Amino acid sequence: MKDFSGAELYTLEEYQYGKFEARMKMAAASGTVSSMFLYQNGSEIADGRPWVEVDIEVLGKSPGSFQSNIITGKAGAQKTSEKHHAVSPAADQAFHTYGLEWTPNYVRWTVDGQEVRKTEGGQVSNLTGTQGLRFNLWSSESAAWVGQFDESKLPLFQFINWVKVYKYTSDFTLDWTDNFDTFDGSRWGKGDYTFDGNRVDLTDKNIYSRDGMLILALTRKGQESFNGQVPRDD
Numbered sequence: 446m447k448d449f450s451g452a453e454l455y456t457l458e459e460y461q462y463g464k465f466e467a468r469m470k471m472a473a474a475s476g477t478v479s480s481m482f483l484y485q486n487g488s489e490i491a492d493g494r495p496w497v498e499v500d501i502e503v504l505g506k507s508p509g510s511f512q513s514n515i516i517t518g519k520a521g522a523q524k525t526s527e528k529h530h531a532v533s534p535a536a537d538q539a540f541h542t543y544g545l546e547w548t549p550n551y552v553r554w555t556v557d558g559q560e561v562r563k564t565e566g567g568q569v570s571n572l573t574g575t576q577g578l579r580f581n582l583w584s585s586e587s588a589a590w591v592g593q594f595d596e597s598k599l600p601l602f603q604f605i606n607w608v609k610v611y612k613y614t615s616d617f618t619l620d621w622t623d624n625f626d627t628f629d630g631s632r633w634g635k636g637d638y639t640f641d642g643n644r645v646d647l648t649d650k651n652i653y654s655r656d657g658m659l660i661l662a663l664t665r666k667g668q669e670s671f672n673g674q675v676p677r678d679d
């Protein structure tokens with residue numbers, strides 16, 4: 446029932462530990478969130494179960510950096526550890542390879558193969574169970590976090606050129622890859638839901654597969670479309 450449409454791409458399967466890489470050009474405008482994250486589906490349910498999530502989020506008002514986070518604890522009582530990391534060129538101006546490594550001992554964030562953060566113990570010990578790999582584009586109702594939402598900047602697009610998923614066994618062995626020449630429905634799902642604090646409804650209408658890229662779009666409701674050209678990843 447919301448007034449804007451965003452999108453979420455998620456792996457149908459979940460994994461226990463691993464390395465996850467995505468080649469992407471992020472979207473950014475005041476008020477938006479453009480992401481790559483690991484998520485234990487159901488964490489949002491306040492029935493006593495744990496929350497398990499690892500994030501990379503480009504906040505719209507600051508396209509030249511991204512926020513890293515680990516969310517543990519439980520719904521209604523989360524433990525977080527937000528940190529920020531510069532990206533150059535800006536996340537919405539060039540493709541970068543974002544990586545997440547997760548093992549029993551640490552979580553590591555990389556940009557173009559270089560470490561920007563590595564957390565050990567504490568929260569990491571509570572990232573039990575499995576997590577699926579996800580990407581979404583939306584807008585937060587918290588202006589303090591992402592800036593006031595500038596609707597005139599819509600539509601916005603996040604482009605994913607390819608994804609690599611490695612098994613935890615380096616400590617990783619490549620498991621599968623997707624270059625996105627097509628939408629593989631046996632591997633991915635398209636989110637159709639929302640949550641409090643999100644100004645948009647995540648909809649499968651805003652997931653597109655064009656010219657070797659998976660595109661996530663953030664549009665005004667009723668204007669869900671992509672007719673432009675995909676950017677080059679030279």
Ligand SMILES: OC[C@H]1O[C@@H](O[C@H]2[C@H](O)[C@@H](O)[C@H](O)O[C@@H]2CO)[C@H](O)[C@@H](O)[C@@H]1O
Pocket residue numbers: 453484486487489581638639640641
């Ligand atoms: O709100 C129901 C919806 O939640 C989805 O997980 C959300 C979660 O609600 C939100 O708090 C967190 O920040 O992001 C995750 C992923 O978008 C869940 O995946 C859906 O199945 C569910 O319908």
Ligand SMILES: [Ca+2]
Pocket residue numbers: 593594595596
């Ligand atoms: Ca506004």
Ligand SMILES: [Ca+2]
Pocket residue numbers: 619620621
């Ligand atoms: Ca395999």
Ligand SMILES: [Ca+2]
Pocket residue numbers: 634635636637649
């Ligand atoms: Ca769906």
Ligand SMILES: [Ca+2]
Pocket residue numbers: 605606607624625626656657658
């Ligand atoms: Ca591709």
